[PDB]
C-alpha cells in the first residue's frame, strides 16, 4: 500500500464518470475544512496486516498534526503494483474500519471506482506533504 | 523519473520555508488557469535520455488534452528511489529546456528545494489524472 498524506486547509471532491464497469460505491460529493487527505493506492499483496499498520500510522500522524478529520481518498496513481479493483475496494473498506479503532475523529472514505474532480488547498508547513508505504 | 499528470482548471503555489539547507532556486509564487500540472519526482539514475523521453510524453499528453500551459512542479514524494537534490535540480532544469523543444505553449518550472503551499482544482474527465515513469 502506497499513501500520500496531504494536510489540507480545505478539500472537496465530486465523482463524475464511472471509472469501472460497475463502481462498488454510489456517486457523491463532499467537502471539508482542515483535514489530513490520504491518497490511498492499494497494492497487490496488501492484506489485513498491511491495513492495520497503515491505520496506526495515519492515526499517529493525525495526532502529530492535531487534525480531527481524515479523508481516505482511493487513488489509482501512486504506484505500479496495483491490486485489482475488488481486492482494492475490500482493503479500503478494511482501512476505514481499522482507522476508527485507532483515531477518534471524523473518518470519511470517499467512493471507489469513479473518476473525480477535486479541489484541495494544501498547507505549506514541513509535514504537510509526506508519503508512506506499508506491506506484510 | 516518476510523474503525476493533473489536468487542472486552476493551480497556484507559494514557497514557504526552505526545505533544503540552501535552495538552488529563489522563493516565489505563481498562479495559473487551465494547465497540465506535472508533479515531478527525479529518481536515482535519471539522465538526459530519461529527460528527453519525459519531455516528449508530456508534450504528447498536452496536445491530446489541448492544453497550452504546463507546470513542472518539483515533488519529492512520488517514489522511494529519489535522486539526491543537486542531481534532481539539474534534471528538472534539463526537463524544462527539453519540454520547450517539444511543446509550443507556456512552460513554468516551479522552484526547487522549498516546502510549498498549493491549491489545485483538478478536472473530472478520464484523462485528468495519470502517472508515468521514465528511465534509461
Ligand atoms: N489499486 C487501487 N487503489 C486505489 N484505488 C483504486 C485502485 N484501483 C482502482 N481504484 C479506484 O478506481 C478508480 C479508477 O481506477 C480510481 N479513481 C481514481 O484514482 C480517481 N481519483 C481519478 O479521478 C479509484 O477510485
Ligand atoms: N528527487 C527529487 N525530485 C523532485 N524534487 C525534489 C527531489 N528531491 C528534493 N526535491 C525538492 O526539494 C524539496 C524538499 O524535498 C521538495 N519540495 C516538495 O516536494 C514540496 N512540493 C513539498 O511542499 C522539492 O522541491
Author numbering:
A (entry chain A), B (entry chain A): 1 to 136
Question: Which sentences from the paper describe this structure?
Answer:
To understand this intriguing mechanism of cognate substrate rejection in NTD, we have solved high-resolution crystal structures of ApNTD, as well as NTD from Methanococcus jannaschii (MjNTD) in complex with non-cognate and cognate substrate analogues L-seryl-3′-aminoadenosine (L-Ser3AA) and L-threonyl-3′-aminoadenosine (L-Thr3AA), respectively. The co-crystal structures of ApNTD were solved in P41212 space group with only one monomer in the asymmetric unit, as the biological dimer axis coincided with the crystallographic twofold axis. L-Ser3AA tightly binds in the active-site pocket in such a way that a conserved hydrogen bond with the main-chain N atom of Lys121 (residue number corresponding to PabNTD) fixes the β-OH group of the substrate in all three NTDs. The carbonyl oxygen of the substrate has a water-mediated interaction with His83 in PabNTD, while the same atom interacts directly with the corresponding His77 in ApNTD and His84 in MjNTD. However, in ApNTD, it has only a water-mediated interaction with the corresponding Glu129, whereas in the case of MjNTD, this group is directly recognized by both Glu135 and His84. In ApNTD, on the other hand, the extra space in the vicinity of Wat1 allows a second ApNTD-specific water Wat5 to be accommodated. Therefore, to ensure that the loosening of interactions observed in ApNTD is significant, we solved multiple high-resolution crystal structures of this enzyme with L-Ser3AA and L-Thr3AA to obtain random snapshots of the substrate analogue in the active site. The average interaction distances of the ligand atoms coming from four L-Ser3AA-bound structures and four L-Thr3AA-bound structures clearly demonstrate a general loosening of the aminoacyl moiety upon L-Thr3AA binding.
